[PDB]
Design a protein around this motif. Sequence first.
Motif, PDB file in Angstrom:
ATOM      1  N   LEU B 293       0.802  -1.232   0.000  1.00  0.00           N
ATOM      2  CA  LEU B 293       0.000   0.000   0.000  1.00  0.00           C
ATOM      3  C   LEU B 293       0.832   1.278   0.000  1.00  0.00           C
ATOM      4  N   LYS B 294       2.093   1.148   0.397  1.00  0.00           N
ATOM      5  CA  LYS B 294       3.026   2.268   0.423  1.00  0.00           C
ATOM      6  C   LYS B 294       3.635   2.611  -0.948  1.00  0.00           C
ATOM      7  N   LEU B 295       3.461   1.722  -1.924  1.00  0.00           N
ATOM      8  CA  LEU B 295       4.066   1.896  -3.249  1.00  0.00           C
ATOM      9  C   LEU B 295       3.525   3.104  -4.016  1.00  0.00           C
ATOM     10  N   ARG B 296       4.415   3.745  -4.765  1.00  0.00           N
ATOM     11  CA  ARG B 296       4.086   4.957  -5.498  1.00  0.00           C
ATOM     12  C   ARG B 296       4.525   4.818  -6.949  1.00  0.00           C
ATOM     13  N   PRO B 297       3.693   5.300  -7.892  1.00  0.00           N
ATOM     14  CA  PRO B 297       4.031   5.210  -9.314  1.00  0.00           C
ATOM     15  C   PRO B 297       5.271   6.012  -9.723  1.00  0.00           C
ATOM     16  N   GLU B 298       5.602   7.056  -8.970  1.00  0.00           N
ATOM     17  CA  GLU B 298       6.751   7.914  -9.283  1.00  0.00           C
ATOM     18  C   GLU B 298       8.080   7.295  -8.843  1.00  0.00           C
ATOM     19  N   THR B 299       8.007   6.283  -7.977  1.00  0.00           N
ATOM     20  CA  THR B 299       9.185   5.774  -7.275  1.00  0.00           C
ATOM     21  C   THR B 299       9.328   4.261  -7.342  1.00  0.00           C
ATOM     22  N   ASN B 300       8.391   3.602  -8.030  1.00  0.00           N
ATOM     23  CA  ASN B 300       8.384   2.143  -8.179  1.00  0.00           C
ATOM     24  C   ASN B 300       8.707   1.706  -9.612  1.00  0.00           C
ATOM     25  N   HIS B 301       9.950   1.932 -10.019  1.00  0.00           N
ATOM     26  CA  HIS B 301      10.358   1.597 -11.376  1.00  0.00           C
ATOM     27  C   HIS B 301      10.745   0.137 -11.561  1.00  0.00           C
ATOM     28  N   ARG B 302      11.172  -0.520 -10.485  1.00  0.00           N
ATOM     29  CA  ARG B 302      11.601  -1.921 -10.571  1.00  0.00           C
ATOM     30  C   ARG B 302      10.489  -2.871 -11.042  1.00  0.00           C
ATOM     31  N   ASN B 303       9.241  -2.464 -10.831  1.00  0.00           N
ATOM     32  CA  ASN B 303       8.088  -3.102 -11.451  1.00  0.00           C
ATOM     33  C   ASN B 303       7.694  -2.307 -12.697  1.00  0.00           C
ATOM     34  N   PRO B 304       8.072  -2.807 -13.887  1.00  0.00           N
ATOM     35  CA  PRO B 304       7.903  -2.024 -15.115  1.00  0.00           C
ATOM     36  C   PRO B 304       6.438  -1.824 -15.504  1.00  0.00           C
ATOM     37  N   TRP B 305       5.567  -2.717 -15.034  1.00  0.00           N
ATOM     38  CA  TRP B 305       4.134  -2.646 -15.304  1.00  0.00           C
ATOM     39  C   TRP B 305       3.365  -1.651 -14.420  1.00  0.00           C
ATOM     40  N   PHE B 306       3.993  -1.185 -13.345  1.00  0.00           N
ATOM     41  CA  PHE B 306       3.276  -0.443 -12.311  1.00  0.00           C
ATOM     42  C   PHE B 306       2.619   0.852 -12.774  1.00  0.00           C
ATOM     43  N   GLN B 307       3.320   1.620 -13.603  1.00  0.00           N
ATOM     44  CA  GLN B 307       2.770   2.869 -14.120  1.00  0.00           C
ATOM     45  C   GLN B 307       1.531   2.599 -14.978  1.00  0.00           C
ATOM     46  N   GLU B 308       1.611   1.595 -15.850  1.00  0.00           N
ATOM     47  CA  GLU B 308       0.458   1.156 -16.638  1.00  0.00           C
ATOM     48  C   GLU B 308      -0.695   0.822 -15.695  1.00  0.00           C
ATOM     49  N   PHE B 309      -0.393   0.037 -14.660  1.00  0.00           N
ATOM     50  CA  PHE B 309      -1.391  -0.383 -13.681  1.00  0.00           C
ATOM     51  C   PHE B 309      -2.007   0.797 -12.943  1.00  0.00           C
ATOM     52  N   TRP B 310      -1.161   1.695 -12.449  1.00  0.00           N
ATOM     53  CA  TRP B 310      -1.648   2.855 -11.714  1.00  0.00           C
ATOM     54  C   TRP B 310      -2.627   3.644 -12.574  1.00  0.00           C
ATOM     55  N   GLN B 311      -2.230   3.877 -13.824  1.00  0.00           N
ATOM     56  CA  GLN B 311      -3.015   4.642 -14.782  1.00  0.00           C
ATOM     57  C   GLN B 311      -4.342   3.973 -15.122  1.00  0.00           C
ATOM     58  N   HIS B 312      -4.341   2.645 -15.213  1.00  0.00           N
ATOM     59  CA  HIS B 312      -5.563   1.907 -15.524  1.00  0.00           C
ATOM     60  C   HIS B 312      -6.504   1.861 -14.331  1.00  0.00           C
ATOM     61  N   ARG B 313      -5.952   1.545 -13.160  1.00  0.00           N
ATOM     62  CA  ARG B 313      -6.725   1.441 -11.912  1.00  0.00           C
ATOM     63  C   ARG B 313      -7.486   2.721 -11.558  1.00  0.00           C
ATOM     64  N   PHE B 314      -6.907   3.874 -11.873  1.00  0.00           N
ATOM     65  CA  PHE B 314      -7.504   5.138 -11.472  1.00  0.00           C
ATOM     66  C   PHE B 314      -8.000   5.970 -12.646  1.00  0.00           C
ATOM     67  N   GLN B 315      -7.891   5.417 -13.855  1.00  0.00           N
ATOM     68  CA  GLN B 315      -8.356   6.075 -15.087  1.00  0.00           C
ATOM     69  C   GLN B 315      -7.822   7.509 -15.233  1.00  0.00           C
ATOM     70  N   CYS B 316      -6.526   7.673 -14.985  1.00  0.00           N
ATOM     71  CA  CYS B 316      -5.863   8.968 -15.105  1.00  0.00           C
ATOM     72  C   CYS B 316      -4.523   8.803 -15.810  1.00  0.00           C
ATOM     73  N   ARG B 317      -3.882   9.926 -16.129  1.00  0.00           N
ATOM     74  CA  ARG B 317      -2.568   9.934 -16.764  1.00  0.00           C
ATOM     75  C   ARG B 317      -1.544  10.541 -15.812  1.00  0.00           C
ATOM     76  N   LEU B 318      -0.383   9.902 -15.717  1.00  0.00           N
ATOM     77  CA  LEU B 318       0.713  10.405 -14.897  1.00  0.00           C
ATOM     78  C   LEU B 318       1.488  11.505 -15.628  1.00  0.00           C
ATOM     79  N   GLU B 319       2.039  12.442 -14.852  1.00  0.00           N
ATOM     80  CA  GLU B 319       2.668  13.667 -15.365  1.00  0.00           C
ATOM     81  C   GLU B 319       3.921  13.448 -16.237  1.00  0.00           C
ATOM     82  N   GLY B 320       4.652  12.362 -15.973  1.00  0.00           N
ATOM     83  CA  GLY B 320       5.844  12.007 -16.749  1.00  0.00           C
ATOM     84  C   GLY B 320       5.718  10.652 -17.425  1.00  0.00           C
TER      85      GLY B 320
END
Lengths: 439, 438
Positions: B293-320
């Motif tokens: 639950l502490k994981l963050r899309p800006e700081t969790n690069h070791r999981n390459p899928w995470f940004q895709e997941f974050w964006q899908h789960r919340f239906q938003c786009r990340l700034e970078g």
Amino acid sequence: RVVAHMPGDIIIGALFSVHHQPTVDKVHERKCGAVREQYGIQRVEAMLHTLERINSDPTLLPNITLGCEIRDSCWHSAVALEQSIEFIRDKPIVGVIGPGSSSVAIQVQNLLQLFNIPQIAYSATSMDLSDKTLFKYFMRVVPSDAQQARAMVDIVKRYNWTYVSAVHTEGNYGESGMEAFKDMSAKEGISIAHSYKIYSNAGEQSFDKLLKKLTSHLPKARVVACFCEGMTVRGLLMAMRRLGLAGEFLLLGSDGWADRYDVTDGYQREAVGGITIKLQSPDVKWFDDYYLKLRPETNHRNPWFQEFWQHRFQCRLEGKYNKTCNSSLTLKTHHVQDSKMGFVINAIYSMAYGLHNMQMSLCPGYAGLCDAMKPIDGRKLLESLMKTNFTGVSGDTILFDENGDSPGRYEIMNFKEMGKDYFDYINVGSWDNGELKMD
Amino acid sequence: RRVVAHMPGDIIIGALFSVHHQPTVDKVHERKCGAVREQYGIQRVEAMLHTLERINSDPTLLPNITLGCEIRDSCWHSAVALEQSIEFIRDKPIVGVIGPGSSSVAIQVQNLLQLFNIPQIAYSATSMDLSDKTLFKYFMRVVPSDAQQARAMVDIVKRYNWTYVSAVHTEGNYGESGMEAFKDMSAKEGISIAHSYKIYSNAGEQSFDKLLKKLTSHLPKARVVACFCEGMTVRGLLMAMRRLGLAGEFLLLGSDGWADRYDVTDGYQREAVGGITIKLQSPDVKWFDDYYLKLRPETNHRNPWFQEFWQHRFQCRLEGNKTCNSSLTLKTHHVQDSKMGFVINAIYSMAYGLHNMQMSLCPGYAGLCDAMKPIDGRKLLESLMKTNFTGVSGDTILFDENGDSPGRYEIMNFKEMGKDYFDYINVGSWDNGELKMD
Ligand SMILES: *[C@@H]1O[C@H](CO)[C@@H](O)[C@H](O)[C@H]1NC(C)=O
Ligand SMILES: *[C@@H]1O[C@H](CO)[C@@H](O)[C@H](O)[C@H]1NC(C)=O
Ligand SMILES: N[C@@H](CCC(=O)O)C(=O)O
Ligand SMILES: N[C@@H](CCC(=O)O)C(=O)O
Ligand SMILES: [Mg+2]
Ligand SMILES: [Mg+2]
Ligand SMILES: [Mg+2]
């Protein structure tokens, strides 16, 4: 593991069952059994010589020479996959002929499709393989068991049987064929007493038990529908010997059995009355001429041949048996051509014609391999193969449907007593595109 | 090329998770997968990553050795899984494999892995077939075979004095092998099956329609429907029930494909209401949620899928179309994967197999010694077949002769807990022969 190499501009792969599948004790090592003739050496030799004839034929693939890499499947899934890995690492294998068995072919196709390598079978008859979403790079020169099972249901109807037993070989061929047979036979009012299954390599105990289980349905269910590998039928036969059950059952078998003597040899009394289905396939004349001239001292290019020769004649070559190999040993003695030979040869030709055609479209005015075929793109080869239209080795037209299947037909054999202590397969009928005709 | 999650070490372990949904007829031949998955993908990827961190921090387990990983996407598909599995074997060596989830997928992977002597430990593949060590020598699991789940399902039918049920299973080894176990068990117990059916999970809308129509004709004599089924198959049916309006006329008795999974029933609750499911007993893992639950899309690069997941789960786009608010958190609507404990025990089994090997081959040393360079995969198998340790929830993990583990089931009921509110209710349990309801 041992391999047969033929040099060339294009290398075609092949899996044949040069030896029997491993026994329970040597499975994990994948150490195979005894050397096989009709299913192995003959098919290997067919492969090499077909390639020579094609390379000698200027009408077909001019200025290109086909070479090959022939591998031992041992009619076994682990062994075939192991060997298929050797095909894909990564000069490339362009396409693969075989392997023999439906579930083995499937395992092979599962690997090859990931590398866009068309595979063309000559004996894998399962309906499952018709599915092009699942097996896109797989085609075959034989019909699928949607028809074979239909034929078996039709034989049952003709002879007025409404009550039968079912046995199939474990794995995709038996399992899928028996499914089709079970479905068709229920619509047509045929009752199945029990459906049994067994692996072709089960011990005598498993077979004994299966035989006893079949007797419990006597006297009503004396006919046994066997969508079975040849070695499963033999198992049933030998179990009949141990249990003294000769003349209790009539076996109605699929193509695993057909007219195969190795199935029935030594066990004729227990097989007599048997009805089998064979895929229509005439002998290829030019094969015997080539094959029966072969000599262990000079047939080096086939690396299993010396092993085979020594096995066949039970002798040691002066190059563990209690004798030495006589000079006057010849194969012409007791020769029997593999019943599926024409299919092997037609499979090899499909591949060649597939390649030739691709060459004509991708290299329109060029002689040999132009850049556009350096390297050969498997996806385009499959397109070329899917539009297969040619005249076979036996003069029939070989065409593929949108499922990668091919039309064919069946001969129906009866295994008869032809006189005191002599038995043989006798053509008694046929089945073709829905029409059963019996003599 | 396909994306991979990497973690360095002296010993690399492979893993297969369904990070995306299977190909949808037809992205099949190109082997393009679909939407990213949370419980079955990202959460498992994350458990793998963090479990290794925890092991590497534990000095009682593999001291001086760093465990790394190669985590690959199976898309819950035989072809993709085999495709990715070839990446493991070509040719630092992968020493062992965790997963994949589905039985017929695990079969395809095992057929390749056995050839290279690479042990495979599953967390959720439950088919009886996999018990055969002559076919699947290099395969073990931390969940019991469906020999018990089948028997349990039969016992549930009998418990409600049902004598005539319909049967549906998912095309594949799991459904076919489990339904066969169920048919050849209920027929002896005197229960009649009107008709047995089957279907692919990825079968189109048209396909599930036909199936349901057939099931409707089996009514009203067969309202109860035994489903040895994957969740998507169950979902498929419910979606067909909506398209027709046959809702409230069927009762679905589901296997562990369904269990207590919200992603099966979400949106189609009233279609599912009344349903009964079997779940493998697996308690939530306390520390997992802490880390996860502490994981963050800006700081969790070791999981390459995470940004895709974050964006899908919340239906938003990340700034970078909308930009992701920094307040968003997984603590909201969080649900932990039901089989989470099994993933974690499977990794620990691998770990313990490696450690036991290390103690006999490297006796007075901490770390990878010369005699384990490289790691003899046949010896790893030997060591893992003697698996016996205390699990993350506290139970004993132990492999039998067939490389299977003991377990037990909870029986769920999917029901309304008031106007328009629905949830899974723990209604009973099954353990080594004994069924209990109240
Ligand atoms: C090839 O087969 C087709 C049947 O689909 C036939 O119509 C055609 O005449 C055949 N060959 C040639 C060279 O025209
Ligand atoms: C497992 O190991 C523990 C501690 O090493 C021991 O107490 C227990 O008896 C073992 N059980 C089995 C079945 O091997
Ligand atoms: N047609 C069988 C093989 C029979 C044989 O050639 O012996 C199969 O699909 O496996
Ligand atoms: N138990 C199923 C998978 C169910 C699931 O975890 O969703 C199998 O062995 O294939
Ligand atoms: Mg030529
Ligand atoms: Mg450590
Ligand atoms: Mg196991």
